């Protein structure tokens, strides 16, 4: 430790001057734009692993001539706070007890493949993908999802259906696009979209909510969920009870496999 | 010596402009620099205290920050393009048929301009403010170039959207500083030209752009009416539809007379036909009257496209004259291409 840090601090500050990684160049350089507004065509010291850093990373630049001293993994935005949990859903299995025939279509295709890939190596083919929950209000639909994600301890994102709709346009689909990038970044992933009947009954103004917004968000979500992306295994859990606010490219199966009636 | 002069300027240094914001004591002044932030500064003895008033431009030093001298008023780079607009000038009667509107314009503008004193007897608020509105192509602006030339008073003029910046309230400061310049100037005519997006209403379910509209609009209201009331500087406002405008820009007592300049009449087209045929060569053409009346649809700009199109039928025949054989195929053709879309407007 002692002799390694001597030469660690040689090329480190005093100020460590956060940058934003615009693009890499492959010669051990990158073009950063700083929050303080001057660009730098930075080097890269080459102990932080040259290509382990990608656009959107936050970079530590040296107090003198800028080299990428190092790279910060994680920079807490308040925008992934909304998705991420701050509380534990202490009611799990058998506090939503009953519907023990409609919990074998979410713990034989959502919880169980993640817990055991063993059973799904045996059949081969690709494991279950997605579910849609629907039925009459007060059948525990909202809590079921929170109760299987408590037990697996996979990365629980939860997003409300009424925050996808903003009174601002175009940044709605960017929010939805974020949610699945976090899911793909975190290998075991369960995304609860709570309420996606709240996309066809809810609108604000007519110039940034309205129909155009509703079409855009729906389409973004197809690319995210599977589309062309080929991203990490995301289980999707959708609460809805109005099942014609959803695309005819989403309520076909092979994205959402078995459908659950309550 | 031409290079010796270059050495004595090069060895001098610059100076930083401010204005006297506020007297603190008598040997210390608050200035607001043109770099921005206010400073507290001292003075050279060469400047006298009683020539230091507030709103007077001063030099400062750039290494001592001390007034050496009073400087003339600062003026916008933009408004020096605006006195370089008067081109496109024409005679007193340079829109034919809308001649009745020229007379109506000068009542408000030129009659109090020469003598404000004939209105003292009358006892009214000095006539200020004009709105022009019509279907485009009737020379609302062509008239402005005529009333700049004929009177010969200081003239400005504004680009449409090139006095819209990227800073909210910096696009207010500019238009503020052209009014000041225009009040220092004797009998100045101020044309706001094609204000339609720089006069919008409250919106703000739009983008952030509509708050630039709104900041900039408020500046006009204070200027027109506050402790500035204009009696020698005159406002002329040109718009293409007068319900694009917010109703404090449709408020008379800032806009006393709201003048409509219409589409040329049946025989207002004819009055342009007699002036634009002396702007061309001909073997002789005085047979306008029936044909133009009954190939109506035109606006004032389309009379000069009938002239140009008669010079295309000429080019086919190989002539350097306008023959009425050339023209009456022209008025038939210019009319037909203009059937493309209406110009339907409902005016107050």
């Amino acid at each position: 430790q002692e002799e390694e840090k001597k030469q660690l601090e040689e090329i480190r500050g005093n100020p460590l001057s956060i940058g934003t990684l615009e693009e890499i160049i492959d010669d051990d350089h990158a073009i950063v734009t700083s929050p303080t507004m001057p660009d730098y065509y930075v080097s890269i010291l080459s102990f932080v692993d040259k290509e382990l850093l990608e656009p959107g990373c936050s970079v530590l630049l040296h107090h003198k001539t800028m080299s990428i001293v190092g790279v910060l993994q994680d920079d807490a935005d308040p925008m992934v706070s909304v998705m991420k949990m701050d509380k534990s859903p202490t009611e799990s299995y058998s506090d939503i007890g009953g519907l023990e025939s409609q919990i074998q279509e979410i713990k034989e295709s959502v919880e169980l493949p993640l817990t055991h890939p063993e059973l799904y190596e045996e059949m081969g083919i690709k494991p279950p993908k997605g579910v849609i929950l629907y039925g009459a209000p007060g059948t525990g639909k909202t809590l079921l999802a929170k109760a299987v994600a408590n037990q697996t301890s996979a990365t629980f994102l939860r997003i409300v259906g009424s925050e996808l709709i903003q009174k601002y346009l175009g940044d709605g689909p960017r929010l939805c696009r974020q949610i699945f990038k976090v899911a793909g970044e975190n290998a075991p992933s369960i995304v609860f979209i709570d309420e996606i009947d709240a996309i066809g009954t809810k609108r604000y103004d007519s110039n940034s909510g309205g129909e155009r917004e509703i079409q855009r968000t729906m389409l973004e979500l197809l690319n995210q969920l599977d589309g062309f992306d080929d991203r990490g295994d995301v289980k999707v859990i959708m609460a809805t009870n109005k099942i014609e606010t959803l695309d005819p490219a989403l309520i076909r199966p092979g994205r959402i496999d078995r459908k659950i009636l309550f | 010596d031409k290079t010796e002069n270059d050495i004595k300027a090069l060895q001098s240094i610059g100076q930083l402009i401010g204005e006297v914001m506020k007297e603190l004591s008598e040997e210390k002044y608050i200035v607001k620099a043109s770099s921005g932030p206010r400073y507290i500064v001292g003075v050279r003895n060469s400047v006298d205290r009683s020539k230091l008033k507030k709103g007077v431009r001063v030099t400062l030093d750039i290494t001592t920050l001390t007034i050496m001298r009073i400087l003339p008023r600062e003026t916008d780079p933009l408004v020096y393009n605006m006195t370089s607009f008067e081109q496109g000038e024409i005679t007193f009667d340079g829109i034919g048929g809308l001649t009745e509107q020229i007379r109506e314009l000068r009542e408000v503008i030129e009659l109090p301009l020469k003598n404000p004193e004939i209105f003292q007897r009358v006892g009214i608020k000095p006539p200020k403010g004009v709105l022009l509105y019509g279907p485009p192509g009737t020379g609302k602006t062509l008239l402005a170039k005529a009333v700049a030339a004929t009177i010969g008073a200081n003239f400005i003029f504004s680009p449409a959207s090139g006095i819209v910046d990227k800073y909210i309230g910096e696009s207010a400061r500019i238009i503020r500083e052209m009014f000041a310049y225009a009040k220092e100037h004797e009998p100045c005519i101020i044309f706001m030209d094609e204000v339609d997006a720089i006069g919008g209403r409250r919106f703000s379910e739009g983008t952030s752009a509509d708050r630039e509209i709104q900041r900039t609009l408020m500046e006009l209201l204070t200027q027109m009416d506050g402790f500035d009331n204009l009696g020698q500087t005159k406002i002329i406002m040109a718009t293409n539809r007068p319900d694009t405008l917010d109703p404090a820009l449709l408020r008379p007592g800032r806009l006393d007379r709201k003048v409509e300049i219409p589409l040329p009449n049946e025989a207002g087209r004819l009055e342009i036909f007699k002036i634009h045929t002396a702007k061309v060569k001909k073997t002789g053409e005085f047979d306008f009257e029936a044909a133009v009346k009954m190939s109506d649809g035109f606006n004032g700009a389309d009379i000069r496209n009938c002239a140009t199109e008669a010079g295309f039928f000429a080019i086919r025949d190989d002539r350097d004259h306008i023959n009425p054989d050339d023209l009456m195929k022209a008025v038939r053709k210019v009319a037909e291409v203009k059937k493309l879309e209406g110009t339907i407007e409902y005016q107050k």
Partner: protein, 328 residues
């Protein structure tokens, strides 16, 4: 470029006179080219590629998946037409010069949702060994308009810098559908990026080795200014699988499935009507769930019967069973 110094705008906003330093030709320096200049006194050190405005187009360049050509969204000549329009003139321009034709660059991929229209293009993406840049049509919309005009434009010219690349315009059913004026709506601000997508395809210079794919769920509403046959040229409909085409897909799906012999894939096609090959992709997984309740390492014929029955009932329960989303 001032003919013999240059006027640069720093990223500090501050404008300066710079010249050529110690390793640059004048030939090197273009107009609109970025340059690195020395922080202390401004002089061109190193030329740099054009424009640091693209940084959110560096999230839409992605690396190709591994999907064998052999796996297809259905066995038809239909993927072979795609192989004449996109694939073959990239490997051998020898034949398209003898014909003397200029290869068709455009294609539409259209038909009912879920047939694997993108599946046959992911197969092609492993195959061509030409860079794929993929686009989202509802990621081209932002609060301030004219921001999205900029984004679209820079992506396309970056493909013009490249040679042998494919820009796959996905999900242009929102932005790329037919323009129409409202008169009160904010529909105009969206119609702006539609117009930018038209004027880049044709350019003022024709496409510099850009094969263009349009992924549309719908052929029904698309712009006649993007549907014109001069930039989408030959367009091959990949339609619903048949009684045989569904057996073919299901033979791949049950090949990848550890199964026991005695199965009929011809039967399964009988049982299903004209329906997606994503339906058939979920026969196997729901048959894998009936295998697991019983505790098997294999699937048989029987569990495919139940699986098929389940998917069919849900189709009635919803809409889109053979639907194009009506019309032609």
């Amino acid at each position: 470029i001032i003919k013999g110094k240059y006027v640069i705008n720093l990223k500090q906003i501050a404008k300066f006179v710079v010249g050529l330093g110690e390793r640059v030709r004048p030939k090197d320096i273009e107009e609109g080219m970025r340059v690195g200049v020395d922080r202390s006194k401004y002089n061109i050190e190193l030329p740099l590629p054009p424009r640091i405005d693209p940084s959110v187009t560096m999230m839409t360049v992605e690396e190709k998946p591994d999907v064998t050509y052999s796996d297809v969204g259905g066995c038809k000549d239909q993927i072979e037409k795609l192989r004449e329009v996109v694939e073959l003139p990239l490997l051998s321009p020898e034949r398209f010069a003898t014909l003397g034709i200029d290869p068709p660059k455009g294609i539409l991929l259209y038909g009912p949702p879920g047939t694997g229209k993108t599946l046959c293009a992911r197969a092609v993406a492993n195959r061509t060994d030409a860079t794929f840049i993929r686009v989202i049509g509802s990621e081209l919309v932002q609060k301030y308009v004219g921001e999205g005009a900029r984004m679209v434009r820079e992506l396309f010219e970056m493909a013009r810098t490249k040679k042998a690349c494919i820009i796959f315009f996905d999900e242009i059913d929102a932005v790329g559908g037919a323009r129409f004026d409202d008169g009160a709506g904010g529909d105009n601000e969206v119609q702006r990026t539609m117009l930018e997508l038209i004027t880049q395809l044709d350019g003022f210079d024709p496409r510099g080795n850009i094969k263009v794919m349009f992924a549309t769920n719908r052929p029904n509403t698309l712009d006649p200014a993007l549907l014109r046959p001069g930039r989408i040229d030959r367009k091959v409909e990949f339609s619903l699988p048949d009684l045989e085409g569904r057996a073919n897909i299901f033979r791949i799906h049950s090949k990848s499935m550890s199964v026991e012999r005695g199965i009929r894939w011809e039967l399964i096609s009988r049982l299903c009507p004209n329906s997606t090959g994503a339906e058939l992709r979920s026969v196997c997984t729901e048959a894998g769930m009936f295998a697991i309740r019983a505790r098997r390492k294999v699937a048989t014929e029987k569990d495919f019967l139940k699986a098929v029955d389940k998917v069919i009932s849900g189709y009635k329960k919803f809409s889109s069973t053979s639907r194009y989303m009506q019309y032609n």
